[PDB]
Structures are given as structure tokens and as C-alpha cells.
Design a protein around this ligand. Structure first.
Ligand SMILES: NC(=O)c1ccc[n+]([C@@H]2O[C@H](COP(=O)([O-])OP(=O)(O)OC[C@H]3O[C@@H](n4cnc5c(N)ncnc54)[C@H](OP(=O)(O)O)[C@@H]3O)[C@@H](O)[C@H]2O)c1
Ligand SMILES: NC(=O)c1ccc[n+]([C@@H]2O[C@H](COP(=O)([O-])OP(=O)(O)OC[C@H]3O[C@@H](n4cnc5c(N)ncnc54)[C@H](OP(=O)(O)O)[C@@H]3O)[C@@H](O)[C@H]2O)c1
Ligand SMILES: NC(=O)c1ccc[n+]([C@@H]2O[C@H](COP(=O)([O-])OP(=O)(O)OC[C@H]3O[C@@H](n4cnc5c(N)ncnc54)[C@H](OP(=O)(O)O)[C@@H]3O)[C@@H](O)[C@H]2O)c1
Ligand SMILES: NC(=O)c1ccc[n+]([C@@H]2O[C@H](COP(=O)([O-])OP(=O)(O)OC[C@H]3O[C@@H](n4cnc5c(N)ncnc54)[C@H](O)[C@@H]3O)[C@@H](O)[C@H]2O)c1
Ligand SMILES: NC(=O)c1ccc[n+]([C@@H]2O[C@H](COP(=O)([O-])OP(=O)(O)OC[C@H]3O[C@@H](n4cnc5c(N)ncnc54)[C@H](O)[C@@H]3O)[C@@H](O)[C@H]2O)c1
Lengths: 318, 318
């Protein structure tokens, strides 16, 4: 028996679990409903941000595997599952391709001033073509902050396909990793800031990267340069971005993540024609949802068959 | 002596002509000004769309070479120059990279619904994220019509970097040209129409391609597919594109070129949130202007030194 605490991101994951297990789905999970349905199941799927505490894990007698819906596992009492022999697996990185494409879309849209030119045409101001000139990406410098799953994939596209010079700042990756995607790893972040025509943020949100892009960073950036953020809103100190755009410390920005989130209806960034937005959708494609559903459903079956899943969070239990 | 009827797009072409010839530049060219400055010069550069008619060509006693600023030569009386032994050259293909990047920008913008999502957020409708789902390009099929300079460069990027299956339709290109850019050349346009998730137009405008994309073509396209046109406005019958969008025969369109051009304030396409525009700027970058200026200046010098230029429009005079 397998319990789905919340629906999966795609129905393909629920059908696959139904092929091998008896699956019960709680659509709107309450804490008492979990207690009454977890006692005899062998696997548990947890939809973010529903919590799974020591009480529910204590009531789960036959539990062997707990799977979250994505990267986040903060809502799961990991300590309670390790003592009971339960392996816990998450499902990270399954929207790497979606965010990569979304990042490329925003870099290009800023270079071609797409939203502004589209609005000008729709208002009958086709003649804006005489004043405004797009930017050619070939030969420009892309600065990547965070050379992880997405950062590496974005680096690889822009360096080879778009023929950009790619700098990368990431102190926790092997020194040769930038060469695998034809980027140059730099040790000093200030160097990336003064050399880049486009800066794209893809770091993990840590205490070191939190508000890493503040006013001091924007001053070092080229006034003609653009900022792209598809990582986390807290990586950018948003008031400093508002100042950077208004005082023309940079030429524009593309933003998929916000702090605070959701953004308020009257966010001061909304008034600028050189700032473009998407409502935290960079990783949301049908394919990414299916991959997350399949990865979660399949790791449950691996544990129930004695096979080692690839994303164990508590390795000391295997 | 060389006369510049209008400024070149970049000063680099004017300096190169000044190294070998005596150059006069008429910045805002009037017809009588052309008459009074062309009588003794050996070469002429014509900035679009200024006309060079039989009266001016008749007054040009020492004329040997006429160069336009771009592809177009409609404003030049070619017949009057052919009789006088004057070679005419255009300057095509010097913005291949700009149009390629602009094409990619529009393909991505449609897939991510960028302008619509940007408008919703700025209008306080951040919650549109619950209604709208972006498209992932990886694994989709791109159909390229016209596998020339632009079509080939778009094919190569989309097939490898973006991991798309690329089909091409071009009956005048060697069968192996598609393989060099990892595309499949198909003989039946219907095959490309029914198989593509994105159709991007890059053909030369001929009587065969004029209004090639009419209502019959849009009916064969997938209701989920998108159209991108950066080639020429006459390749698409615009009323049929309006019908195709309104009746949802296709899912959206990105348009950089228009028929008629310029588009009017009340274009019926403006009302649709899934149609995006740019005001015929796909090829307009500083780099493209520099290359066009260099090519025009160099073809003038080639003729003045007896060397055959690569883009002669009237070859029967050589
Ligand atoms: N929406 C976009 O992607 C984007 C990007 C850059 C600039 N713009 C807008 O384009 C217009 C022209 O900007 P500019 O860089 O060419 O400087 P400008 O000519 O001085 O104005 C400005 O209104 C700016 O806000 C829009
Ligand atoms: N890189 C650049 O080319 C560049 C640089 C700076 C500025 N611009 C902007 O572009 C505008 C004109 O650029 P351009 O004239 O030098 O480029 P062009 O290639 O000569 O384009 C001239 C026009 O003629 C038509 N055309 C295209 N191919 C043609 C062909 N083989 N034969 C006949 N007509 C053809 C097109 O309009 P239709 O389809 O409607 O007939 C095109 O817009 C200027 O107003 C300027 O604002 C361009
Ligand atoms: N690039 C764009 O602006 C773009 C592209 C496609 C769809 N849209 C819009 O997004 C919304 C979602 O439509 P849909 O494509 O998912 O199909 P639908 O809503 O199921 O019809 C619609 O309002 C559509 O007009 C915008
Ligand atoms: N819908 C969306 O917008 C969306 C979707 C998925 C992921 N994300 C976010 O995108 C970002 C990248 O995702 P990922 O899968 O590539 O993560 P990842 O774990 O694969 O890589 C993150 C990188 O950050 C690097 N890093 C750590 N500290 C750094 C520092 N001080 N400076 C620079 N780099 C540092 C790490 O070395 C690591 O390589 C994450 O913040 C993730 O939450 C957003
Ligand atoms: N600012 C702009 O939007 C801009 C800039 C430059 C060029 N263009 C336009 O882009 C288009 C392509 O430019 P290019 O430099 O690659 O031209 P190109 O001459 O290199 O290639 C055009 C292709 O069209 C193909 N073709 C001819 N007839 C066809 C048919 N019936 N079906 C399918 N294909 C056919 C030809 O075989 C050729 O290969 C041209 O229409 C050009 O005028 C637009």
C-alpha cells in the first residue's frame, strides 16, 4: 500500500504507482487524515509544503520509503525516519531543462527589447525602430553565478550555440568544471561583475548568497549590462535592484523569482519598461512535471524492491 | 571619386573608402543634389530607400559601380545602369547572426508566453501562473521553410543546443545541406506543416513563396503549433493569419515583417495575446550595420580595381 499525501504534479506518476501498489490519494491533506491513513502503508508521497512530523511517522508501522514532490524536504521529520529505518528520497533537478530554456528566453528578450518593441507596435508606434536598436549576443560576455545543474546548462548553450564569452563564479565546484561547458571559472566575483554584459543568477540560496546582489554589486556591473534571476528572490536585495534600474546603474533586468513572493500588486519594479517578469514559472513545463512525478513514483518502487534509489537524503539508513 | 548618397550604417565603411578614394557624403540626399554631385564620380553608394533613376545615371559620366546598402535594389534603375556598363551590387547576408538570434528570441518568447506573462504580472495578475503553462522546446519539432543563410543557422542551434528535431523545406538546396546542420530535408511541405510544433519562415520572397502561408497551410498546422515570420511580409497572407489565430487553427505567432508595411494602428492582429511583434528589426544590430557598411565599401573598391565583386546584380556587364 502507498499513500499519496497530496496529488502529484502529473497523473503519470499516480498511474505508475497503481500498476504495482494499492494507492490511496488524499487531495486536501489534513493532519488527522494522515494519521488515519498512514498506519498500514508501505510508501508515502508528500506534496510540498505539507508537513510529515514524528507523530505520523510513528503511526506508520509498515513505512519504508518517504518521497517528497521536489527538492524541499524541510517539512519532513528526517530524524524520526532514520531511527525507524525509513529511507527518504527527494526529487531535485527535474526542471533543469525548463529553467535553462526559460533563462535563455529572458537573456534573448532583453537583448532584443522584445516586450518593449511588442508594446510599441501594438500601440501603432512601429516607427520606434528608428530610435531603438537591439543587441547582438554573439561575442558578448555572459556572467553566470552558480555553476550547478542549471548554471552549467545555460553556460553550455550560450558559449557554443550563441558564441558568447561565458564567465562563471562558483567556489564549490571542481576547478575544471567550467571547461566541460566551455566557460572560464573566475575566483573573484568582482571580476565577473565588471566584465559581463549579461549576468544570470543560478546559485543555491545560502547565507553567503542571500542578498549577494546588492547595491555594491550593481555599481561594479556595467551600466549597459542586464541582470537575469531565475534562482531565488532572496539572492537579490530587491530595493537595491529598484535603485539600480531607476538610477540606470544597469540597463535592465529579467525576473522570475521575487522577494517577497508573491510580489505585491503595486511592486515598484512594474513601472519600468526595461524590467520584464514571469510569475515563478521558469521550471514549470508539462515535461518537468511528468519527470518529477515519474522520479518520485519510481524511487518508491525501488525501495520496495530493495534497489538503491538515486536521491537518498539519509544515506546512513541503506 | 566616390559619392555616398546617404550615410552608411557605420563609419567603418566610410573610412575604408576614404583610404583609397576621394569620398563626398550627402547626408540628407535630395534629387537635385544627386544630380550636381554624381557627374564625375566613379562609384556610388545609395542608402535605402533613396532612389537612383535614369536621370542621375545619365549624368554620371565616369560611373562604374553602384552599391546599395542592403538586399533591396528596387529604387535603382538597373536597366539604365546595365546599358551604360555600370555594375550594380547589393549587400545581402550581412545580418545572418542578428536575424538568427532574433528568430530564437521569438521562438522562445512564444514557448514561454513571455509578453503575456510579463503583462499579467505588471497588471497585478501574478496568479495567472495557475492558468498558463510554458512549453518546453526540448524534443519538439521545428519546421524551417527556406534553408538558406538564416534558416541553416537557426536549424543548427535548435537541433543541437536546444535538442529540437528540425525539419527543413527548401526545394532548391543540396540534399546534404540539412545534414550539416543536423536537420532533415523533407520534400513535401505538408509533412513539415503537420509535424512541426514551431514553424519559422526563412525563404526568399519569390512568386512561388508569395503568400505561401495561407489558410490552407494554417489548417494543416497543428492547433498547438506556432508561426514565426522574420523573412518577408508577403510570404504570409495576413488575413488568413488573422483567421488562423481567431479560429485557433494555430496557437500563436511572432511577426517581425508585415504586409502591408508599416502596420497600421488598428491591425486586427493586435487584439490577440498570443501574437507578438517587432517592428522589422530582426537584422538591425550594430554589428550587422558594420558588416553591411564594410561589404558596400569593399565591393566599390573591388570594381575600381578591376576585381569582380561577389554580389553583382547585373552580371551581363562584366
Ligand atoms: N523590455 C526590454 O526587454 C527592454 C530592454 C532594454 C531596454 N528597453 C527599453 O527600450 C527603450 C530604449 O532603451 P535604450 O537601451 O535603447 O536606451 P535609450 O535610447 O537612451 O532610451 C527604453 O525605453 C528601455 O526601457 C526595454
Ligand atoms: N543591418 C541593417 O540592414 C540595418 C542597419 C541599420 C539600420 N537598418 C534599418 O533598416 C532599414 C533599411 O535597411 P536596408 O535597406 O539597408 O536593408 P535591405 O536589405 O536593403 O531592405 C530593404 C527593404 O526592401 C525589401 N527587401 C528585402 N529584400 C529585398 C530584396 N532582395 N529585393 C528587394 N527588396 C527587398 C524589404 O522590404 P519589403 O519586404 O516590404 O519589400 C526590406 O525591408 C533602415 O530604415 C534602417 O532603419 C538596417
Ligand atoms: N507568446 C505569447 O504571448 C503567448 C503564446 C501562447 C499563448 N499565449 C496566451 O496564454 C494563454 C494560454 O493559452 P494556451 O496556449 O495555454 O491555450 P488555451 O488557453 O487552452 O486555449 C492564452 O491567453 C494565450 O493568448 C500567449
Ligand atoms: N521555477 C524556478 O525559477 C526554479 C526552478 C528550479 C530551481 N530554481 C532555482 O535555481 C537555482 C539553481 O538551481 P540548480 O538545480 O542548478 O542548483 P544546484 O544545486 O545544481 O547548483 C547550485 C550552485 O550554487 C553554487 N553556489 C553555492 N554557493 C555559491 C556562492 N556563494 N556563489 C556562487 N555560487 C554558489 C553551488 O556550488 C552549486 O553549484 C536554485 O536556487 C534553485 O532553487 C528555480
Ligand atoms: N530584418 C529582417 O527581418 C531580415 C533581415 C535579413 C533577411 N531577411 C529575410 O530573411 C529571409 C532569408 O534570408 P537569407 O539571408 O537566409 O536568404 P537566402 O537567399 O540565403 O535563403 C533563402 C532560401 O529561400 C529558399 N527558397 C526559395 N524558394 C523556396 C520555396 N518555394 N520554399 C522553401 N524555400 C525556398 C531558397 O532556396 C534559399 O535557400 C529573406 O526573405 C530575407 O529577405 C529578413
Amino acid at each position: 500500500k502507498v499513500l499519496l499525501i497530496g496529488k502529484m504534479y502529473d497523473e503519470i506518476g499516480e498511474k505508475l504507482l497503481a500498476e504495482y501498489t494499492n494507492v490511496e490519494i488524499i487531495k486536501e491533506p489534513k493532519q488527522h487524515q494522515i494519521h488515519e491513513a498512514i498506519q498500514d502503508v508501505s510508501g508515502v508521497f508528500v506534496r510540498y509544503p505539507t508537513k510529515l512530523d514524528a507523530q505520523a511517522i510513528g503511526l506508520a508501522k509498515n513505512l519504508k520509503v518517504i518521497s517528497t514532490s521536489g527538492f524541499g524536504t524541510d517539512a519532513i521529520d528526517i530524524a524520526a525516519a532514520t531511527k525507524r529505518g525509513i529511507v527518504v528520497v527527494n526529487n531535485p533537478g527535474l526542471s533543469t531543462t525548463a529553467v535553462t530554456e526559460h533563462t535563455l528566453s529572458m537573456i534573448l528578450a532583453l537583448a532584443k527589447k522584445l516586450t518593449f518593441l511588442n508594446q510599441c507596435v501594438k500601440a501603432g508606434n512601429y516607427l520606434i525602430r528608428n530610435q531603438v536598436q537591439p543587441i547582438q549576443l554573439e561575442g558578448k560576455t555572459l556572467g553566470i553565478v552558480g555553476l550547478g545543474r542549471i548554471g552549467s546548462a545555460v553556460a553550455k548553450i550560450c558559449s557554443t550555440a550563441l558564441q558568447m564569452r561565458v564567465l562563471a563564479y562558483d567556489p564549490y565546484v571542481p576547478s575544471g568544471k567550467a571547461d566541460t561547458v566551455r566557460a572560464t571559472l573566475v575566483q573573484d566575483l568582482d571580476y565577473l561583475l565588471t566584465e559581463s554584459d549579461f549576468v544570470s543568477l543560478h546559485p543555491e540560496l545560502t547565507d553567503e548568497t542571500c542578498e549577494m546582489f546588492d547595491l555594491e554589486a550593481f555599481k561594479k556591473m556595467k551600466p549597459s549590462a542586464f541582470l537575469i534571476n531565475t534562482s531565488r528572490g532572496k539572492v537579490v536585495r530587491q530595493p537595491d535592484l529598484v535603485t539600480a534600474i531607476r538610477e540606470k546603474l544597469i540597463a535592465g533586468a529579467a525576473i522570475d523569482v521575487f522577494e517577497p513572493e508573491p510580489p505585491a500588486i503595486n511592486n515598484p519594479l512594474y513601472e519600468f519598461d526595461n524590467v520584464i517578469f514571469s510569475p515563478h514559472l521558469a521550471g514549470v513545463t508539462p515535461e518537468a512535471g511528468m519527470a518529477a512525478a515519474l522520479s518520485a513514483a519510481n524511487q518508491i518502487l525501488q525501495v520496495l524492491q530493495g534497489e538503491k534509489p538515486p536521491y537518498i537524503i539519509n544515506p546512513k539508513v541503506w
